[PDB]
Design a binder for this molecule. Structure first.
Ligand SMILES: CC(C)C(=O)SCCNC(=O)CCNC(=O)[C@H](O)C(C)(C)COP(=O)(O)OP(=O)(O)OC[C@H]1O[C@@H](n2cnc3c(N)ncnc32)[C@H](O)[C@@H]1OP(=O)(O)O
Length: 195
């Protein structure tokens, strides 16, 4: 296939993709999607399949993996540093109508490949979540134990997506996304080590 950088003209399709991949409380507004493409234009890609935007990634260069400490999903734009050693992912979605076709694995490996070619980038970081924690919440399993797989069962399908591509857990940010009630408002830091 072919993948290209994002453009402000794709805003209409990037919103329709956001509305399909996420429920209403967790969707990024039209202004936020435009802010990501304009702030870091070389750090946003769009996967095209049959001429449709079925996959999109958002990233901005931050100072490093340590700058994510105490971050918040709303106050996330202030971490932009054009001379930082880490590229923070801000979103990596694919359309539910085309999922499980090894498409999301292609976008993640492309961003990891682009960061190895951009100079100064040491790691690819980001605050992920857990899509199947409420099921383990009723079983008495704590959130921190569930992130590190200490619950006895398998990984979370969301965290296993990053862990399956060389990432490692780098901490938990409680109160990161209060509208993400499926994770008690918390987020999970993932770090893709490079070089
Ligand atoms: C920076 C922050 C915002 C982030 O990192 S975003 C957090 C990730 N997104 C979310 O949590 C919202 C929900 N979105 C999804 O679940 C999307 O399906 C996704 C996470 C983008 C995954 O993309 P997909 O369209 O499913 O395609 P792919 O990623 O290429 O792989 C397909 C599946 O094969 C799975 N797979 C592939 N190989 C394996 C192996 N060896 N073992 C187990 N599972 C595998 C892969 O984990 C995917 O699992 P599912 O989540 O159950 O679909």
């Amino acid at each position: 296939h072919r993948i290209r950088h994002a453009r402000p003209s794709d805003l209409d399709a990037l919103c329709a993709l956001e509305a399909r991949c996420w429920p209403a409380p967790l969707r990024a507004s039209r202004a936020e999607l435009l802010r990501r493409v304009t702030t870091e234009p070389r750090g946003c890609w769009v996967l095209l399949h049959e001429g449709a935007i079925v996959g999109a990634t958002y990233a901005q260069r931050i100072a490093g993996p340590a700058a994510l400490a105490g971050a918040r999903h709303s106050e996330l734009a202030g971490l932009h540093d054009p001379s930082g050693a880490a590229l923070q992912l801000l979103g990596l979605n694919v359309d539910p109508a085309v999922r499980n076709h090894d498409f999301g694995s292609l976008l993640l490996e492309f961003v990891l490949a682009a960061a190895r070619l951009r100079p100064g980038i040491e790691n690819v970081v980001g605050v992920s979540r857990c899509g199947d924690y409420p099921r383990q919440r009723a079983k008495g399993l704590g959130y921190e134990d569930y992130v590190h797989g200490r619950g006895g069962g398998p990984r979370d399908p969301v965290l296993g997506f990053h862990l399956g591509h060389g990432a490692r857990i780098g901490g938990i940010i409680s109160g990161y996304r209060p509208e993400d009630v499926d994770n008690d408002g918390a987020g999970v830091i993932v770090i893709h080590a490079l070089r």
